[PDB]
Structure formats: C-alpha cells, structure tokens
C-alpha cells in the first residue's frame, strides 16, 4: 500500500504545490518549466561554476529565448510593503 500510494501522495502534494505554493496562480504544466529551470540552473551552477544565460537556458529547454525571460518574470515571487530597508 506504501509502494501503491506513493503515486497518489506525490501527485496530490505536487498538484497542491503547483497551485497554492505561489501567491499568483501558474498551472502545473507552466510551473514544472520553472521548477526544472531552477533544478537545471542549480545543476549548471554546480557543474560549470558560474550563472548560465537565458540563451543557454533556452538552448537547454529547447525554447525561444524570449519565453525564458517571460517565465522568470512569473518566477519573481512578490515582495512585501512593511519591510525595514
């Protein structure tokens, strides 16, 4: 029942984390790209050492480099008003 339910636990948890984790809504099929972008950016930060570029990100994802710019602006988690600066 563990080896069975592992599916449903994961799918439920990640289906929730797709929606309710962020303030602004972004569907699972349009946030998985941001999560995997995060993961492979961590991988490319780990391996190559420096930060990779949206062009190389778009070469890794196999997308238009004007989309990875569009997905980062979504990946900007919003900032509060009452903050000591």
């Amino acid at each position: 029942f563990s080896t069975y339910a592992t599916w449903w636990i994961r799918q439920a948890i990640t289906r929730a984390m797709a929606d309710q984790a962020r303030t602004i809504r972004i569907p699972v099929h349009m946030v998985e790209v941001i999560n995997k972008l995060g993961r492979i950016q961590r991988e490319l930060l780990q391996d190559l050492g420096r930060e990779p570029t949206p062009e190389e990100l778009a070469k890794e994802m196999d997308i238009t480099p004007e989309k990875v710019l569009e997905i980062q602006q979504y990946a900007r988690e919003p900032i509060s008003l009452d903050q000591t600066i």
Partner: protein, 62 residues
C-alpha cells in the same frame, strides 16, 4: 561662490512579462515642441538647457 551641481538620472528598458520596454524618441500622445532636445535615437543632445518638465530620456512601456 558659484558652484556646479550635477544630478545623475538613471533609467533602463527591462523586458517585463507584458512585452518589451524600449528607449526611443517617439511617444504617441505627446506634442512635437517637447520632442525637440531628443535626437532620433531618443536621448537629449549634449548641452541642451532643461526646464523642470523636460524629457531627459525618451522611454516607452508596452
């Protein structure tokens, strides 16, 4: 006792999720006379005296 005081004014064209920002002369709903100090590229020509209200950088949002 006359001094020279230089105020720095910084602006940029960042690609917002809507479209892409641009630093260009032409704006739609303006007058011609105010678009004078600027050149074709959308920056003021060097040495043009500015009155409070003048355009220092021509920038457009999507």
């Amino acid at each position: 006792l006359t001094s020279i005081h230089i105020e720095e004014h910084e602006i940029d064209a960042r690609d917002t999720k809507l479209g892409a920002e641009e630093i260009t002369r032409d704006i739609p709903n303006v007058s011609d006379e105010v678009l004078a100090d600027l050149d074709e590229r959308g920056i003021v020509r060097i040495g043009a005296e500015v009155r409070d209200g003048d355009i220092l950088v021509g920038k457009v949002t999507p």
